[PDB]
Amino acid sequence: RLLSRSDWGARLPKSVEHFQGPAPYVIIHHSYMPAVCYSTPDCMKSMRDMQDFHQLERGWNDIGYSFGIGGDGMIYTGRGFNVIGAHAPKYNDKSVGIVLIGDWRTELPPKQMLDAAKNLIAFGVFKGYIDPAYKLLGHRQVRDTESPGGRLFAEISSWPHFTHI
């Protein structure tokens, strides 16, 4: 279920900065725009659209997230493991930031998206990129703290590793 950056046709990063040791945090995001992607070709386009917005419109080094999750249930590599992100203030150098593609302000993502996120986390721990005792957070805990978080936040609040901050 894991697609590399070259698999979705990513532009190279402008610059890459690494952080050391396994990430102590996992942070769950949604894209808002682009909207939910239904097939692998559509989700590859969603990843390029986010990268283009972050690199070309905002002048950032790369798509801000570590990984994306499509409606196809696939995992898309963004900056990847142990790369400083641009997704969560105070956590960019100590987390894996996972974006579920789509507008998940209120609605619950489909199961294959939730399953892909759990599989990515398990993979990251198994390969030594995520701390085994990682802390799981929602974006409304670290970044947009007045966002209510919706059914997605309620869902991740029930997962093992979910942490109050």
Short mmCIF file of N, CA and C in Angstrom, two decimals:
data_model
loop_
_atom_site.label_atom_id
_atom_site.label_comp_id
_atom_site.label_asym_id
_atom_site.label_seq_id
_atom_site.Cartn_x
_atom_site.Cartn_y
_atom_site.Cartn_z
N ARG A 1 0.82 -1.22 0.00
CA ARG A 1 0.00 0.00 0.00
C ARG A 1 0.86 1.28 0.00
N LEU A 2 2.19 1.24 -0.09
CA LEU A 2 3.05 2.47 0.05
C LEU A 2 3.65 2.88 -1.28
N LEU A 3 3.36 4.12 -1.69
CA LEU A 3 3.80 4.74 -2.94
C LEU A 3 4.87 5.76 -2.61
N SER A 4 5.94 5.74 -3.34
CA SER A 4 7.06 6.68 -3.15
C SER A 4 6.68 8.03 -3.79
N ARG A 5 7.52 9.01 -3.52
CA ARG A 5 7.37 10.33 -4.14
C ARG A 5 7.47 10.26 -5.65
N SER A 6 8.39 9.44 -6.16
CA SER A 6 8.53 9.34 -7.62
C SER A 6 7.32 8.63 -8.21
N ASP A 7 6.68 7.73 -7.45
CA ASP A 7 5.47 7.04 -7.96
C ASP A 7 4.38 8.02 -8.30
N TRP A 8 4.20 9.12 -7.55
CA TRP A 8 3.14 10.09 -7.87
C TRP A 8 3.66 11.29 -8.65
N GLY A 9 4.93 11.24 -9.05
CA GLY A 9 5.49 12.27 -9.95
C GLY A 9 5.88 13.54 -9.20
N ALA A 10 6.31 13.43 -7.95
CA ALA A 10 6.68 14.59 -7.15
C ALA A 10 7.84 15.34 -7.82
N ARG A 11 7.78 16.65 -7.69
CA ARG A 11 8.97 17.51 -7.94
C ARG A 11 9.98 17.22 -6.84
N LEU A 12 11.27 17.38 -7.12
CA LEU A 12 12.25 17.27 -6.02
C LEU A 12 11.95 18.32 -4.95
N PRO A 13 12.35 18.05 -3.70
CA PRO A 13 12.33 19.11 -2.69
C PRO A 13 13.32 20.21 -3.05
N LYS A 14 13.03 21.44 -2.64
CA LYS A 14 13.99 22.57 -2.83
C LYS A 14 15.19 22.36 -1.90
N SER A 15 14.95 21.81 -0.72
CA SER A 15 15.96 21.53 0.31
C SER A 15 15.32 20.53 1.26
N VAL A 16 16.14 19.71 1.90
CA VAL A 16 15.70 18.71 2.89
C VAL A 16 16.52 18.88 4.15
N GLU A 17 15.84 18.94 5.28
CA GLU A 17 16.50 18.88 6.58
C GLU A 17 15.98 17.68 7.34
N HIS A 18 16.88 16.88 7.84
CA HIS A 18 16.56 15.67 8.61
C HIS A 18 16.49 15.98 10.10
N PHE A 19 15.76 15.15 10.82
CA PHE A 19 15.81 15.11 12.29
C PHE A 19 16.23 13.70 12.70
N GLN A 20 16.75 13.57 13.91
CA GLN A 20 17.38 12.30 14.35
C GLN A 20 16.38 11.45 15.14
N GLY A 21 16.67 10.14 15.20
CA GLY A 21 16.08 9.15 16.14
C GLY A 21 14.63 8.96 15.75
N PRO A 22 13.94 7.96 16.31
CA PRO A 22 12.56 7.72 15.90
C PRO A 22 11.68 8.88 16.37
N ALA A 23 10.66 9.18 15.58
CA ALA A 23 9.74 10.29 15.90
C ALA A 23 8.92 9.94 17.12
N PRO A 24 8.85 10.83 18.13
CA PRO A 24 8.03 10.57 19.30
C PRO A 24 6.53 10.85 19.11
N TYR A 25 6.18 11.58 18.04
CA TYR A 25 4.77 11.97 17.80
C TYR A 25 4.33 11.56 16.40
N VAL A 26 3.04 11.25 16.33
CA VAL A 26 2.31 11.10 15.05
C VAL A 26 1.19 12.10 15.11
N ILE A 27 1.03 12.89 14.05
CA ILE A 27 -0.04 13.92 14.01
C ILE A 27 -0.92 13.65 12.81
N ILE A 28 -2.22 13.64 13.02
CA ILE A 28 -3.22 13.42 11.96
C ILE A 28 -3.80 14.73 11.47
N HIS A 29 -3.77 14.98 10.19
CA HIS A 29 -4.28 16.15 9.47
C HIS A 29 -5.33 15.72 8.44
N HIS A 30 -6.05 16.72 7.94
CA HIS A 30 -6.78 16.58 6.65
C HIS A 30 -6.43 17.72 5.74
N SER A 31 -6.66 17.57 4.45
CA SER A 31 -6.17 18.54 3.45
C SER A 31 -7.13 19.72 3.33
N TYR A 32 -8.41 19.53 3.64
CA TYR A 32 -9.50 20.49 3.33
C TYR A 32 -9.66 20.62 1.80
N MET A 33 -8.65 21.17 1.11
CA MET A 33 -8.51 21.19 -0.37
C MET A 33 -7.08 20.75 -0.66
N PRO A 34 -6.83 19.72 -1.49
CA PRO A 34 -7.84 19.08 -2.33
C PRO A 34 -8.90 18.25 -1.61
N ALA A 35 -9.99 17.98 -2.30
CA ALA A 35 -11.13 17.18 -1.78
C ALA A 35 -10.78 15.69 -1.88
N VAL A 36 -11.67 14.84 -1.36
CA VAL A 36 -11.48 13.35 -1.32
C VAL A 36 -11.18 12.85 -2.73
N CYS A 37 -10.22 11.95 -2.80
CA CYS A 37 -9.73 11.38 -4.08
C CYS A 37 -10.14 9.91 -4.11
N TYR A 38 -10.62 9.43 -5.25
CA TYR A 38 -11.35 8.15 -5.27
C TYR A 38 -10.58 6.99 -5.89
N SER A 39 -9.57 7.26 -6.67
CA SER A 39 -8.78 6.27 -7.44
C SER A 39 -7.31 6.66 -7.30
N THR A 40 -6.42 5.74 -7.62
CA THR A 40 -4.98 5.99 -7.51
C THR A 40 -4.57 7.13 -8.45
N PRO A 41 -4.98 7.19 -9.74
CA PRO A 41 -4.60 8.35 -10.55
C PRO A 41 -5.10 9.67 -9.95
N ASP A 42 -6.31 9.69 -9.39
CA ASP A 42 -6.84 10.93 -8.77
C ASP A 42 -6.01 11.32 -7.53
N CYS A 43 -5.66 10.34 -6.71
CA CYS A 43 -4.91 10.61 -5.47
C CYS A 43 -3.48 11.04 -5.78
N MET A 44 -2.89 10.48 -6.83
CA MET A 44 -1.55 10.96 -7.28
C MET A 44 -1.66 12.45 -7.65
N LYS A 45 -2.71 12.83 -8.40
CA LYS A 45 -2.96 14.24 -8.74
C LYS A 45 -3.16 15.09 -7.48
N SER A 46 -3.88 14.58 -6.49
CA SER A 46 -4.11 15.32 -5.22
C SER A 46 -2.76 15.62 -4.56
N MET A 47 -1.84 14.69 -4.56
CA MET A 47 -0.52 14.88 -3.95
C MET A 47 0.24 15.95 -4.73
N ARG A 48 0.21 15.88 -6.06
CA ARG A 48 0.88 16.94 -6.86
C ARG A 48 0.21 18.29 -6.61
N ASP A 49 -1.08 18.35 -6.51
CA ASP A 49 -1.77 19.64 -6.27
C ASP A 49 -1.30 20.21 -4.94
N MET A 50 -1.21 19.41 -3.88
CA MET A 50 -0.75 19.92 -2.56
C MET A 50 0.71 20.34 -2.66
N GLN A 51 1.56 19.56 -3.30
CA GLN A 51 2.96 19.92 -3.45
C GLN A 51 3.06 21.25 -4.21
N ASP A 52 2.28 21.40 -5.27
CA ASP A 52 2.36 22.62 -6.11
C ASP A 52 1.93 23.81 -5.26
N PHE A 53 0.90 23.66 -4.47
CA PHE A 53 0.42 24.78 -3.63
C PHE A 53 1.53 25.15 -2.65
N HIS A 54 2.13 24.18 -1.98
CA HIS A 54 3.12 24.46 -0.92
C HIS A 54 4.40 24.98 -1.55
N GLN A 55 4.94 24.34 -2.57
CA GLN A 55 6.22 24.79 -3.17
C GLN A 55 6.05 26.04 -4.02
N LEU A 56 5.10 26.06 -4.95
CA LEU A 56 5.04 27.13 -5.97
C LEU A 56 4.27 28.33 -5.43
N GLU A 57 3.15 28.13 -4.73
CA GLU A 57 2.33 29.27 -4.24
C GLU A 57 2.92 29.77 -2.93
N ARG A 58 3.36 28.92 -2.01
CA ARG A 58 3.87 29.38 -0.69
C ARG A 58 5.39 29.47 -0.66
N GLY A 59 6.10 28.90 -1.62
CA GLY A 59 7.57 28.99 -1.69
C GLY A 59 8.25 28.09 -0.66
N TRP A 60 7.52 27.09 -0.15
CA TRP A 60 8.06 26.14 0.86
C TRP A 60 8.97 25.12 0.20
N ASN A 61 9.69 24.36 1.00
CA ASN A 61 10.69 23.41 0.46
C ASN A 61 10.02 22.27 -0.28
N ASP A 62 8.81 21.94 0.11
CA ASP A 62 8.16 20.67 -0.31
C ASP A 62 6.72 20.68 0.20
N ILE A 63 5.92 19.74 -0.27
CA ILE A 63 4.63 19.43 0.39
C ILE A 63 4.88 19.33 1.90
N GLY A 64 4.05 19.95 2.72
CA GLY A 64 4.37 20.08 4.14
C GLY A 64 4.24 18.81 4.94
N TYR A 65 3.48 17.85 4.47
CA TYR A 65 3.19 16.63 5.24
C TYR A 65 4.22 15.54 5.00
N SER A 66 4.34 14.67 5.98
CA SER A 66 5.22 13.50 5.87
C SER A 66 4.70 12.47 4.87
N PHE A 67 3.42 12.20 4.96
CA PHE A 67 2.72 11.20 4.15
C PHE A 67 1.29 11.66 3.90
N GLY A 68 0.72 11.29 2.79
CA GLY A 68 -0.69 11.42 2.49
C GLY A 68 -1.37 10.07 2.42
N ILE A 69 -2.68 10.06 2.62
CA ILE A 69 -3.54 8.87 2.54
C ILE A 69 -4.64 9.16 1.55
N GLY A 70 -4.80 8.31 0.54
CA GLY A 70 -5.88 8.52 -0.44
C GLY A 70 -7.13 7.69 -0.17
N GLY A 71 -8.22 8.05 -0.83
CA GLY A 71 -9.47 7.29 -0.82
C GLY A 71 -9.33 5.92 -1.43
N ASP A 72 -8.25 5.71 -2.18
CA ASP A 72 -7.85 4.39 -2.69
C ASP A 72 -7.27 3.50 -1.59
N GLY A 73 -7.16 3.97 -0.37
CA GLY A 73 -6.51 3.24 0.71
C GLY A 73 -5.00 3.11 0.58
N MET A 74 -4.40 3.89 -0.30
CA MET A 74 -2.94 3.88 -0.45
C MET A 74 -2.29 4.99 0.35
N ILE A 75 -1.03 4.73 0.68
CA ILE A 75 -0.14 5.67 1.39
C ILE A 75 0.78 6.31 0.36
N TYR A 76 0.89 7.60 0.39
CA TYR A 76 1.70 8.40 -0.54
C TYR A 76 2.81 9.04 0.26
N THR A 77 4.06 8.80 -0.09
CA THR A 77 5.17 9.44 0.61
C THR A 77 5.22 10.93 0.28
N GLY A 78 5.21 11.78 1.29
CA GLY A 78 5.44 13.23 1.19
C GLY A 78 6.90 13.51 1.51
N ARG A 79 7.18 14.25 2.58
CA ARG A 79 8.59 14.44 2.97
C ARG A 79 9.15 13.13 3.47
N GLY A 80 8.32 12.23 3.99
CA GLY A 80 8.85 10.94 4.47
C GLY A 80 9.36 10.96 5.89
N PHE A 81 9.86 9.84 6.35
CA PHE A 81 10.31 9.68 7.75
C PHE A 81 11.59 10.48 8.01
N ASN A 82 11.66 11.04 9.21
CA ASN A 82 12.87 11.74 9.73
C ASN A 82 13.23 12.96 8.90
N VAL A 83 12.25 13.54 8.22
CA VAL A 83 12.44 14.83 7.52
C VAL A 83 11.60 15.87 8.24
N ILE A 84 12.19 17.04 8.50
CA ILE A 84 11.47 18.12 9.19
C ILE A 84 10.30 18.55 8.29
N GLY A 85 9.11 18.53 8.83
CA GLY A 85 7.88 18.85 8.10
C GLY A 85 7.54 20.32 8.14
N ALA A 86 6.45 20.64 7.50
CA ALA A 86 5.81 21.98 7.60
C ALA A 86 4.32 21.77 7.77
N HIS A 87 3.95 21.14 8.88
CA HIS A 87 2.55 20.77 9.15
C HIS A 87 2.12 21.08 10.60
N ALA A 88 2.99 21.19 11.59
CA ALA A 88 2.59 21.24 13.01
C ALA A 88 3.62 22.04 13.78
N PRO A 89 3.27 23.29 14.18
CA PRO A 89 4.19 24.14 14.90
C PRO A 89 4.72 23.47 16.17
N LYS A 90 6.02 23.49 16.39
CA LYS A 90 6.67 22.91 17.60
C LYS A 90 6.85 21.40 17.42
N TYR A 91 6.21 20.76 16.41
CA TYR A 91 6.30 19.29 16.22
C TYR A 91 6.96 18.94 14.90
N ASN A 92 7.34 19.87 14.04
CA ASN A 92 7.80 19.52 12.68
C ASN A 92 9.07 18.68 12.69
N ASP A 93 9.93 18.85 13.67
CA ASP A 93 11.21 18.12 13.77
C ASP A 93 11.11 16.93 14.70
N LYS A 94 9.92 16.45 15.01
CA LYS A 94 9.77 15.36 16.01
C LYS A 94 8.47 14.58 15.78
N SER A 95 8.01 14.56 14.53
CA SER A 95 6.73 13.90 14.26
C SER A 95 6.70 13.35 12.85
N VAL A 96 5.72 12.48 12.69
CA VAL A 96 5.24 12.07 11.35
C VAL A 96 3.88 12.73 11.18
N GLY A 97 3.76 13.64 10.21
CA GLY A 97 2.49 14.32 9.94
C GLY A 97 1.79 13.62 8.81
N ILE A 98 0.63 13.02 9.03
CA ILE A 98 -0.12 12.19 8.07
C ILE A 98 -1.35 12.98 7.64
N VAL A 99 -1.48 13.31 6.39
CA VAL A 99 -2.68 14.00 5.88
C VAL A 99 -3.62 13.00 5.27
N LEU A 100 -4.86 12.94 5.72
CA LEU A 100 -5.94 12.20 5.05
C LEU A 100 -6.50 13.13 4.00
N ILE A 101 -6.37 12.80 2.73
CA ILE A 101 -6.80 13.69 1.64
C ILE A 101 -8.31 13.83 1.68
N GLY A 102 -8.75 15.09 1.67
CA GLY A 102 -10.17 15.37 1.64
C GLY A 102 -10.54 16.36 2.70
N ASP A 103 -11.79 16.76 2.64
CA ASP A 103 -12.37 17.70 3.61
C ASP A 103 -12.90 16.86 4.75
N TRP A 104 -12.13 16.77 5.81
CA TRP A 104 -12.55 15.99 7.00
C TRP A 104 -12.72 16.91 8.20
N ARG A 105 -13.25 18.09 7.96
CA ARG A 105 -13.61 18.99 9.10
C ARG A 105 -14.66 18.33 9.97
N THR A 106 -15.63 17.65 9.37
CA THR A 106 -16.81 17.14 10.11
C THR A 106 -17.03 15.66 9.91
N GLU A 107 -16.93 15.16 8.68
CA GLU A 107 -17.30 13.75 8.35
C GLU A 107 -16.17 12.76 8.69
N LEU A 108 -16.53 11.49 8.86
CA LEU A 108 -15.60 10.37 9.15
C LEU A 108 -15.06 9.83 7.84
N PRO A 109 -13.72 9.83 7.65
CA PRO A 109 -13.14 9.22 6.45
C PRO A 109 -13.55 7.76 6.34
N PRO A 110 -13.62 7.26 5.11
CA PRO A 110 -13.88 5.83 4.89
C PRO A 110 -12.82 4.92 5.51
N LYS A 111 -13.20 3.70 5.85
CA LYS A 111 -12.42 2.78 6.68
C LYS A 111 -11.04 2.55 6.04
N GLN A 112 -10.98 2.42 4.70
CA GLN A 112 -9.70 2.08 4.04
C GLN A 112 -8.68 3.19 4.30
N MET A 113 -9.12 4.43 4.50
CA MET A 113 -8.21 5.56 4.82
C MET A 113 -7.72 5.42 6.26
N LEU A 114 -8.61 5.12 7.18
CA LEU A 114 -8.20 4.91 8.59
C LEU A 114 -7.26 3.73 8.70
N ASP A 115 -7.55 2.64 8.01
CA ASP A 115 -6.71 1.43 8.01
C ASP A 115 -5.32 1.76 7.44
N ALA A 116 -5.27 2.53 6.35
CA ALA A 116 -3.97 2.91 5.74
C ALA A 116 -3.14 3.69 6.75
N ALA A 117 -3.77 4.62 7.46
CA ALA A 117 -3.04 5.42 8.47
C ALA A 117 -2.48 4.50 9.54
N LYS A 118 -3.25 3.54 10.03
CA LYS A 118 -2.77 2.61 11.09
C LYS A 118 -1.65 1.76 10.56
N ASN A 119 -1.76 1.32 9.31
CA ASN A 119 -0.71 0.49 8.69
C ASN A 119 0.59 1.31 8.52
N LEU A 120 0.47 2.57 8.09
CA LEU A 120 1.68 3.43 7.96
C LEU A 120 2.38 3.56 9.33
N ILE A 121 1.61 3.80 10.36
CA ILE A 121 2.17 3.98 11.73
C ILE A 121 2.87 2.68 12.13
N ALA A 122 2.21 1.56 11.94
CA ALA A 122 2.80 0.26 12.33
C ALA A 122 4.09 0.00 11.57
N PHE A 123 4.13 0.32 10.27
CA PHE A 123 5.31 0.18 9.41
C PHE A 123 6.44 1.04 9.94
N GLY A 124 6.10 2.31 10.23
CA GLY A 124 7.10 3.24 10.76
C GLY A 124 7.72 2.75 12.06
N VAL A 125 6.89 2.22 12.96
CA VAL A 125 7.47 1.63 14.20
C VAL A 125 8.34 0.42 13.85
N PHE A 126 7.87 -0.44 12.97
CA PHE A 126 8.57 -1.71 12.69
C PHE A 126 9.94 -1.41 12.05
N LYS A 127 10.02 -0.37 11.23
CA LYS A 127 11.28 0.00 10.55
C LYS A 127 12.13 0.99 11.35
N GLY A 128 11.72 1.37 12.55
CA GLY A 128 12.53 2.15 13.48
C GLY A 128 12.45 3.63 13.30
N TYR A 129 11.45 4.13 12.55
CA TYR A 129 11.24 5.57 12.26
C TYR A 129 10.29 6.25 13.23
N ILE A 130 9.46 5.47 13.91
CA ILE A 130 8.49 5.99 14.89
C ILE A 130 8.78 5.33 16.24
N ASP A 131 8.76 6.09 17.29
CA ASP A 131 9.03 5.53 18.64
C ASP A 131 7.96 4.49 18.94
N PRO A 132 8.28 3.29 19.49
CA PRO A 132 7.23 2.34 19.83
C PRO A 132 6.16 2.87 20.77
N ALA A 133 6.54 3.81 21.65
CA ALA A 133 5.63 4.44 22.62
C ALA A 133 5.24 5.82 22.12
N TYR A 134 5.04 5.95 20.80
CA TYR A 134 4.71 7.26 20.21
C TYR A 134 3.42 7.79 20.86
N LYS A 135 3.29 9.10 20.78
CA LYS A 135 2.09 9.84 21.18
C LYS A 135 1.33 10.25 19.91
N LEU A 136 0.06 9.90 19.84
CA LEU A 136 -0.80 10.25 18.69
C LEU A 136 -1.59 11.51 19.03
N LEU A 137 -1.57 12.48 18.11
CA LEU A 137 -2.29 13.74 18.28
C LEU A 137 -3.10 14.03 17.03
N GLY A 138 -4.19 14.75 17.18
CA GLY A 138 -4.91 15.39 16.05
C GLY A 138 -4.40 16.81 15.78
N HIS A 139 -4.50 17.29 14.53
CA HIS A 139 -4.07 18.65 14.16
C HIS A 139 -4.69 19.73 15.07
N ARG A 140 -5.91 19.50 15.54
CA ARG A 140 -6.55 20.58 16.37
C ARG A 140 -5.88 20.63 17.73
N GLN A 141 -5.07 19.66 18.14
CA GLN A 141 -4.30 19.79 19.38
C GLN A 141 -3.02 20.63 19.25
N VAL A 142 -2.49 20.80 18.05
CA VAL A 142 -1.10 21.35 17.91
C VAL A 142 -1.04 22.58 17.01
N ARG A 143 -2.01 22.76 16.13
CA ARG A 143 -1.94 23.77 15.08
C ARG A 143 -3.21 24.61 15.19
N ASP A 144 -4.31 24.18 14.58
CA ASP A 144 -5.55 25.01 14.53
C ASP A 144 -6.46 24.69 15.74
N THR A 145 -6.10 25.18 16.92
CA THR A 145 -6.67 24.67 18.18
C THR A 145 -8.12 25.10 18.42
N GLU A 146 -8.64 26.09 17.68
CA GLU A 146 -10.05 26.43 17.79
C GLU A 146 -10.88 25.57 16.82
N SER A 147 -10.28 24.74 15.93
CA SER A 147 -11.07 23.82 15.06
C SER A 147 -11.70 22.75 15.94
N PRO A 148 -12.98 22.41 15.72
CA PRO A 148 -13.64 21.40 16.56
C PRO A 148 -13.14 19.97 16.29
N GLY A 149 -12.62 19.69 15.09
CA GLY A 149 -11.95 18.41 14.74
C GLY A 149 -12.89 17.36 14.15
N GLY A 150 -14.19 17.41 14.44
CA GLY A 150 -15.18 16.57 13.74
C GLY A 150 -15.12 15.11 14.16
N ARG A 151 -15.73 14.30 13.33
CA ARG A 151 -15.75 12.84 13.55
C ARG A 151 -14.35 12.27 13.43
N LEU A 152 -13.46 12.87 12.62
CA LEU A 152 -12.09 12.33 12.53
C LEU A 152 -11.41 12.45 13.90
N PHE A 153 -11.47 13.59 14.55
CA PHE A 153 -10.83 13.76 15.86
C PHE A 153 -11.46 12.79 16.86
N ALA A 154 -12.78 12.66 16.81
CA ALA A 154 -13.43 11.72 17.78
C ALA A 154 -12.89 10.31 17.57
N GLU A 155 -12.70 9.94 16.31
CA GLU A 155 -12.20 8.61 15.93
C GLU A 155 -10.78 8.44 16.45
N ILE A 156 -9.86 9.35 16.14
CA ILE A 156 -8.46 9.13 16.55
C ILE A 156 -8.36 9.21 18.09
N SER A 157 -9.26 9.97 18.77
CA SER A 157 -9.26 10.09 20.25
C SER A 157 -9.48 8.71 20.88
N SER A 158 -10.04 7.76 20.14
CA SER A 158 -10.32 6.37 20.61
C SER A 158 -9.17 5.42 20.30
N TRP A 159 -8.14 5.84 19.55
CA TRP A 159 -7.04 4.93 19.16
C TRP A 159 -6.06 4.77 20.30
N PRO A 160 -5.41 3.59 20.40
CA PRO A 160 -4.29 3.49 21.31
C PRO A 160 -3.26 4.54 20.86
N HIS A 161 -2.54 4.99 21.84
CA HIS A 161 -1.48 6.01 21.76
C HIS A 161 -2.06 7.42 21.79
N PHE A 162 -3.36 7.60 21.68
CA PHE A 162 -3.94 8.96 21.70
C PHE A 162 -3.56 9.62 23.02
N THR A 163 -3.10 10.87 22.96
CA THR A 163 -2.50 11.57 24.09
C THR A 163 -3.18 12.92 24.25
N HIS A 164 -3.55 13.29 25.47
CA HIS A 164 -3.98 14.68 25.82
C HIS A 164 -2.73 15.53 26.04
N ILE A 165 -2.75 16.79 25.59
CA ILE A 165 -1.55 17.68 25.50
C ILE A 165 -1.75 18.85 26.48
#
